[PDB]
Write a protein that binds this ligand. Structure first.
Ligand SMILES: *[C@@H]1O[C@H](CO)[C@@H](O)[C@H](O)[C@H]1NC(C)=O
Ligand SMILES: [Cu+2]
Length: 227
């Protein structure tokens, strides 16, 4: 359980969607982060993979604001403290807004994977995962925006998948957090994109998995990494 509390871009903080404050406020502030109804600080499990909830989390609506990023710039997402128990991958996608992200139909967004990190070491099962790298970095993740994509407005879909309960059907816990970015620079690629509801299926090999046993490999879920 947790959420993204702050985003650092080009030397300033953009405050996150504080899901334990703003849903209680009823005139809440404009941010680059999507609003959600996930006030339990919880997840979308396999029952929700073909519902709109998987796209940017339960009940999500676009952020009003968009943050500009320098060409090949960093976006640092700062989480609430991630529990060591919640081992699993950290995955990052962009989808083009083709206009103001604040007005997109989330159900039409087509994501391409720009970064993935999975099982790092398995010397002591359940091992060390991208989620453990996030904890070791004091609960932040750094995303480098590619220089090779067409600039424009994009949703960054940033996600931890916790696998501590994932040996059961629908046990994996997805924690997507979306923010609005203005990608800048000279790129031209329009990578093939995947609908939110086709990212994951509840029987995928990196989704329905016992992490407590020795693992020889881990297949990071979702569509193929764009390079
Ligand atoms: C996180 O930062 C705090 C100090 O603010 C420190 O005490 C902690 O050990 C840091 N780093 C890691 C790897 O946990
Ligand atoms: Cu949890």
């Amino acid at each position: 359980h947790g959420f993204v509390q702050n985003i650092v871009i080009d030397g300033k903080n953009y405050g996150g969607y504080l899901v334990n404050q703003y849903p209680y406020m009823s005139n809440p502030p404009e941010v680059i982060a999507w609003s959600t109804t996930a006030t339990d600080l919880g997840f979308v499990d396999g029952t929700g993979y073909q519902t709109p909830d998987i796209i940017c989390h339960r009940g999500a609506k676009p952020g009003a604001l968009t943050a500009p990023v320098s060409p090949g710039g960093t976006v640092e997402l700062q989480w609430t403290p991630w529990p060591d128990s919640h081992h699993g991958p950290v995955i990052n996608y962009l989808a083009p807004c083709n206009g103001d992200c604040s007005t997109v139909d989330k159900t039409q967004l087509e994501f391409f994977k720009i970064a993935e990190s999975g099982l790092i070491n398995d010397d002591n099962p359940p091992g060390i995962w991208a989620s453990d790298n996030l904890i070791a970095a004091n609960n932040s993740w750094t995303v480098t925006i590619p220089t090779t994509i067409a600039p424009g407005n994009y949703v960054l879909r940033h996600e931890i998948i916790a696998l501590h309960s994932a040996q059961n059907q629908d046990g994996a816990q997805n924690y997507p957090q979306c923010i609005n970015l203005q990608v800048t620079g000279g790129g031209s690629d329009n990578p093939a994109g995947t609908l939110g509801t086709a990212l994951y299926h509840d029987t995928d090999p990196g989704i329905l998995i016992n992490i407590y046993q020795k693992l020889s490999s881990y297949i990071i879920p979702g569509p193929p990494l764009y390079t």
